[PDB]
Each structure stands twice: as structure tokens, then as C-alpha cells.
Amino acid sequence: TIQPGTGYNNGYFYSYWNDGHGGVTYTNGPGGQFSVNWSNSGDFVGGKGWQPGTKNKVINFSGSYNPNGNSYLSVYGWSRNPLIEYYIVENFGTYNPSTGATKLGEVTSDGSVYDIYRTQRVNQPSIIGTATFYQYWSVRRNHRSSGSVNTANHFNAWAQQGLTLGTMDYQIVAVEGYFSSGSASITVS
């Protein structure tokens, strides 16, 4: 594993964070590749991409994703002003992150319908410190662990629905886990 933090590896921005509970290892590989191996983890998120992201990136990902418990595989990032945490969820484990959330529409992109949702985090950690902020979600109906994500289709549908993004901060393909186990190996471009 590498140390939790951010930086650049083989041309790609990376972010790896965990809550210190243990049980998760994150590795940077060649090019845009990263691996995650976890067993009875705590809370964590890791992956590769860009800092800053853009609102019209076509993100390619490929590999394997084998969660056992609560985990997501997503295009994941933030905007500033307004502060937004966003997800284009391509696959997940035992928990659909939109469970109980308000549905804000549908968008078709890259071979599947996605359902759109908005949630709110109240006094939670963020890229700017503790804050209350919205999260935007596109959740893919047809789960997969390789493909291409035309981010503009999502960001435009969100905007249409009143889910505005500010200036982009980082934008990665991320494996997220919450007290679960699994393995994953993903290459981004």
C-alpha cells in the first residue's frame, strides 16, 4: 500500500483516504492503474484521475471490481462555489447509495439509463473543512466495471434539473468502501 494522501503517479492525479480503522491497502500501478484490496475495512476512498477535472471529460476505465459488502465504483469528484460532492456510479456492492434519496430525473449515457438523485451532507468533512453541502448522483442501472463515461451528459442533465456545479476540483475513478471487504484493479484514461 501507499500512504493516504494525494499526489501524481505516472501522469495521473491520485487520492487515497481512509479513517484509520485498518483493513485496506491502496496501490498505484503503471499509467492510470490502481489497485485496492480490503478486508473488514473502515471507511475509505481511493483512485486516479485529474486535478482539476473538467465538465466535458470522456473518462475511460477498465478492470475488475469485486466488493463483498458496502462499496462503490464511480466517477467521483468535487466542485467549489458551490461545494458539491458528485458521483457517477457504475457499480456497487450491498448498498445502492441512492436508497431513500430524492430522485431528480433520468439520463441515458454510454449504454445505460442512470437515475439521478440529490442528497445532503450536514456538517460533514469536505475538501474545504466541515460543511453542509449537496451530493449529486447518477446511478447506472446496468452495472459494469469497464466502460466510458461521457461526463458532460451527466453534468448537463444535472444542470437541466437544477443541480448546479461550480468550479471543478479533483475528478477520479474511485473505489469507495464503508466497513466491507473486496478487491479491485482499475485502469483510468
Swiss-Prot record:
Entry keyword annotation includes tRNA processing: no
Ranges of residues in domain GH11: 1-188
Location of the active site: 85 (nucleophile), 176 (proton donor)
Location of this chain's protein in the cell: Secreted
Single annotated GO MF: endo-1,4-beta-xylanase activity
Chief place of localization: secreted
GO terms under cellular component: extracellular region
Activity dependence on pH, as recorded: Optimum pH is 4.5-5.5. Stable from pH 3.0 to 8.5 at room temperature and from pH 4.0 to 7.5 at 40 degrees Celsius.
Highest taxon listed in the record's lineage: Eukaryota
Role of this protein: Glycoside hydrolase involved in the hydrolysis of xylan, a major plant cell wall hemicellulose made up of 1,4-beta-linked D-xylopyranose residues. Catalyzes the endohydrolysis of the main-chain 1,4-beta-glycosidic bonds connecting the xylose subunits yielding various xylooligosaccharides and xylose. The catalysis proceeds by a double-displacement reaction mechanism with a putative covalent glycosyl-enzyme intermediate, with retention of the anomeric configuration. Produces xylobiose and xylose as the main degradation products.
The name this protein goes by in its record: Endo-1,4-beta-xylanase 2
Organism annotation: Hypocrea jecorina (strain ATCC 56765 / BCRC 32924 / NRRL 11460 / Rut C-30)
Gene symbol of the encoding locus: xyn2
Positions spanned in the full protein: 35 to 223 of 223
